[PDB]
Design a protein around this ligand. Structure first.
Ligand code: EQU
Ligand code: EQU
Lengths: 127, 126
């Protein structure tokens, strides 16, 4: 069914846990088959599980990425939510952190129909 | 179109105005045809008087407080998203509400759309 607000919080928290462990195929299964991803928001959307899988493989497949919520998931009553988090990876061969906000809309099957990831280089820190 | 750094400044200024409760200054931040969806999932509000009435009803008691809970996330196409918390008293129960605002600005630096993500799951009693 279309996720309630509590169900949205649970799904978006699970998504972060899958990012953190690097489980590309489980992430892709969270998306609807024809989902759209804009990441970073402002760039051309990518469409569909094949393209989304390739995107997450390029992003997470090389060198350790960690991710964690930095505050609660904010959920709506129409199957949408937004969440703040941080990702830690390597940049310039050194540890770096990136602050992100993800906005997601879910479909009536509980799958991610759209994701917009808000971030730019103003959100990238080091040291 | 505001740069990502300008977006950070503007969205943080918006929170500052909400926290002091200056309705007129908040409304002046919006573009002529702006839309407000707050909470996201509700029908959009159009119109300067309508946006002013909305902030009057929300903040008109002077006691609402608001602070960023993390940095503004800003794009290169004049949009941004920010996490914050609002504190207020609801029929005698002191409460706090976690919110994320997503904003799109125009080429004059004014808010064209605001979408406020929150619901009752984000409400707490302090
Ligand atoms: C891909 C990324 C790691 C993961 C990640 C980045 C940016 C936005 C994201 C949004 C997500 O919903 C999940 C993961 C990321 C990073 C940007 C650079 C980088 O290394
Ligand atoms: C209106 C409100 C106070 C302020 C506020 C609420 C919800 C979303 C907001 C979004 C904003 O960008 C600025 C202020 C609010 C509150 C919900 C209940 C309440 O008292």
């Amino acid at each position: 069914n279309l996720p309630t607000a509590q169900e949205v919080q649970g799904l978006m928290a699970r998504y972060i846990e899958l990012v953190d462990v690097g489980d590309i195929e489980a992430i892709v299964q969270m998306y609807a088959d024809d989902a759209t991803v804009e990441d970073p928001f402002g760039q051309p959307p990518i469409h569909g599980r094949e393209q989304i899988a390739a995107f997450y493989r390029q992003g997470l497949g090389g060198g350790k990425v960690r991710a964690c919520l930095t505050g609660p998931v904010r959920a709506s009553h129409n199957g949408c939510g937004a969440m703040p988090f941080r990702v830690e990876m390597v940049w310039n061969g050194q540890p770096c952190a990136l602050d992100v906000i993800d906005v997601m809309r879910f479909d009536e099957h509980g799958r991610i129909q759209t994701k917009q990831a808000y971030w730019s280089e103003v959100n990238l820190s080091v040291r």
